[PDB]
Structures are given as structure tokens and as C-alpha cells.
Design an enzyme around this catalytic site. Structure first.
Site: not given
Ligand SMILES: [Cu+2]
Length: 99
Positions: A84, A87
Site C-alpha cells: 500500500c 502505508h
Molecule cells: Cu494502506
């Protein structure tokens, strides 16, 4: 196979983080909690012959709502790392093994 983006408790994880799939099975990344999320494949951690641009969101594209999905089907066998983008540095990464 369905893979949640964010755990129900707010964790920044794919759920499941590691799983195996037969070649060609559709993988449905489903936005869950703790937005925003997206899904990209690591050009350095996929089988040789794989082009990650075909199987990755644009880094600019983010999912901010529950139930949005990003769907891919991987035809080359081997190990693939996905992450991600927002993230990645918080450990939201995963591994799918295509067999
Ligand atoms: Cu994420």
C-alpha cells in the site's frame, strides 16, 4: 480470493497478509477500514517476466471508502510482493504465492 485493506480494528494490514492462489484466480482487494489505501506490486519482488504496471494502481489513485475494490489476476507462478503506497513504511505489505 478477497483481501481486506485495513483490519476491522484499524490496523494497517492486508487481510490476509500472505496467501497462495492458483494461477489466474481473481484477487479482489476490498477497501475495509483506516483509509486511504491502494495496491501496487513491487517491481523488485515479483517473478521474472512480470510487468508490475499492469497489475498495480497508479500511486496517485487512493481508495477512501469502504467497499471499493481493486481486482487483478496473476498468471505467472512464483512469489509476488504487494504494498500500500501510503502505508508501505508502516508495514502494510503482503505476499501472494501463485501456484
Ligand atoms: Cu494502506
Amino acid at each position: 480470493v478477497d483481501v481486506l485493506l485495513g483490519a476491522d480494528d484499524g490496523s494497517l494490514a492486508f487481510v490476509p497478509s500472505e496467501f497462495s492462489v492458483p494461477a489466474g484466480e481473481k484477487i479482489v482487494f476490498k477497501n475495509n477500514a483506516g483509509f486511504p489505501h491502494n495496491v501496487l506490486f513491487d517491481e523488485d519482488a515479483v517473478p521474472s517476466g512480470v510487468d508490475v504496471s499492469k497489475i498495480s494502481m497508479s500511486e496517485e489513485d487512493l481508495l477512501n471508502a469502504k467497499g471499493e475494490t481493486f481486482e487483478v489476476a496473476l498468471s505467472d507462478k512464483g512469489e509476488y510482493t504487494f504494498y500500500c503506497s501510503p502505508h508501505q513504511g508502516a508495514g502494510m505489505v503482503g505476499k501472494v504465492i501463485v501456484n
